[PDB]
Amino acid sequence: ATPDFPTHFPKSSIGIENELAGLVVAMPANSAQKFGYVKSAQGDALFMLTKDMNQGSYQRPPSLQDGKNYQNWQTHTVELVSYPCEMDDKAAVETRKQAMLWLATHFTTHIDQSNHQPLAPIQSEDGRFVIEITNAKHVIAAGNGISAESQGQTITMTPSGQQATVGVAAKGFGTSATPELRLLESAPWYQKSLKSQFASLTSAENLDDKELAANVFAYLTSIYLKTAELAKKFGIYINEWDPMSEQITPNANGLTDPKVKNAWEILPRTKPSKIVEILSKSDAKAVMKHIKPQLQSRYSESLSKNVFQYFQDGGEVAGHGINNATVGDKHSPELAILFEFRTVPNELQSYLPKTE
Numbered sequence: 001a002t003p004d005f006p007t008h009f010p011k012s013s014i015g016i017e018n019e020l021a022g023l024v025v026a027m028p029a030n031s032a033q034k035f036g037y038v039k040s041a042q043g044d045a046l047f048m049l050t051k052d053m054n055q056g057s058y059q060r061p062p063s064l065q066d067g068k069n070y071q072n073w074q075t076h077t078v079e080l081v082s083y084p085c086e087m088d089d090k091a092a093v094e095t096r097k098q099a100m101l102w103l104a105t106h107f108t109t110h111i112d113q114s115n116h117q118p119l120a121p122i123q124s125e126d127g128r129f130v131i132e133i134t135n136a137k138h139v140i141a142a143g144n145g146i147s148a149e150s151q152g153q154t155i156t157m158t159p160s161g162q163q164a165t166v167g168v169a170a171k172g173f174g175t176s177a178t179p180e181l182r183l184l185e186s187a188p189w190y191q192k193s194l195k196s197q198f199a200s201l202t203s204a205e206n207l208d209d210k211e212l213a214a215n216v217f218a219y220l221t222s223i224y225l226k227t228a229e230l231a232k233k234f235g236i237y238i239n240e241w242d243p244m245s246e247q248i249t250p251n252a253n254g255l256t257d258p259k260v261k262n263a264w265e266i267l268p269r270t271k272p273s274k275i276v277e278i279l280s281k282s283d284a285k286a287v288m289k290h291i292k293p294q295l296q297s298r299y300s301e302s303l304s305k306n307v308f309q310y311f312q313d314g315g316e317v318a319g320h321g322i323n324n325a326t327v328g329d330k331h332s333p334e335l336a337i338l339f340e341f342r343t344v345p346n347e348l349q350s351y352l353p354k355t356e
């Protein structure tokens with residue numbers, strides 16, 4: 001049983017994703033994504049061992065026949081997914097990077113002497129790291145997993161395979177209070193001007209928290225407007241909106257299509273409707289009522305109604321989100337909203353392991 005991610009952090013949090021080159025994991029079809037994890041000797045969970053990109057069906061090399069059933073087994077690339085930690089926790093960030101680099105050296109030895117065999121639950125030579133295997137029905141093989149023997153590969157990581165995920169208190173988005181917030185607010189889809197715009201529309205209104213209301217408005221409006229922009233750009237079917245009704249040819253499979261996700265650059269990972277919870281029933285009604293016209297002044301009635309309704313009923317920006325993450329006091333937890341850096345920017349490069 002792989003431990004679930006911790007959901008609570010006192011302040012801003014960081015998670016890292018790292019797709020490996022030089023090997024594959026082969027497993028039965030419809031297998032769980034997680035097959036193991038690496039923890040410290042003290043028991044702290046550092047990262048998960050996951051299958052990532054499907055590379056086709058697995059064919060056991062004839063010279064490695066072992067009387068075992070490998071029927072319908074699929075081959076996938078490996079991705080190392082960290083357990084989130086506090087962004088300012090240097091020790092936690094460093095242990096994750098070192099633990100990933102150690103596992104790469106272990107994999108390099110494994111494809112050399114135990115090619116086409118499962119990873120065994122072992123402790124590192126220095127005692128720092130422990131592998132726990134949660135799905136024994138797997139094998140690790142060099143390159144593409146077609147040949148019985150490797151090409152003497154050194155298992156590496158690379159920025160092309162790297163992502164970072166940052167969690168921040170929802171109430172902080174638009175305040176620019178910290179360098180994380182300012183980095184997130186630099187997302188091209190985020191329109192800061194919408195804050196002062198909300199203020200102008202709501203002068204006669206007695207708002208419970210007008211500055212929080214303006215922050216939520218700018219955040220949600222920015223997401224809604226970008227979704228519409230992307231739906232028009234890529235010809236995405238949103239709710240009942242048909243891109244072909246507006247002579248737009250579909251050129252993506254949906255919101256979760258890698259190219260649509262890449263177009264966000266800083267991808268929201270939390271369900272937009274969750275942010276309404278940080279406001280009073282009254283302030284939320286005020287924020288929500290002002291969103292429709294921002295869509296309707298830039299997009300058709302159909303695209304505007306459909307994007308608005310989609311996010312109202314709990315629609316996700318790009319598939320299942322991270323919606324149970326929290327910040328602040330453990331006893332009175334506040335909503336955390338998460339963002340995926342599709343490409344790791346220079347400001348976040350220090351959180352990522354670098355093959356020596």
Ligand SMILES: Nc1ncnc2c1ncn2[C@@H]1O[C@H](COP(=O)(O)OP(=O)(O)O)[C@@H](O)[C@H]1O
Pocket residue numbers: 005006007008009013014015016017081082083084085164165166167322325326336338
């Ligand atoms: N509270 C959090 N703060 C920051 N990052 C988080 C948090 N919870 C999860 N993440 C991160 O989310 C990233 C990947 O999310 P994941 O659900 O596994 O991706 P996907 O489902 O799209 O394959 C990891 O880097 C992980 O650490």
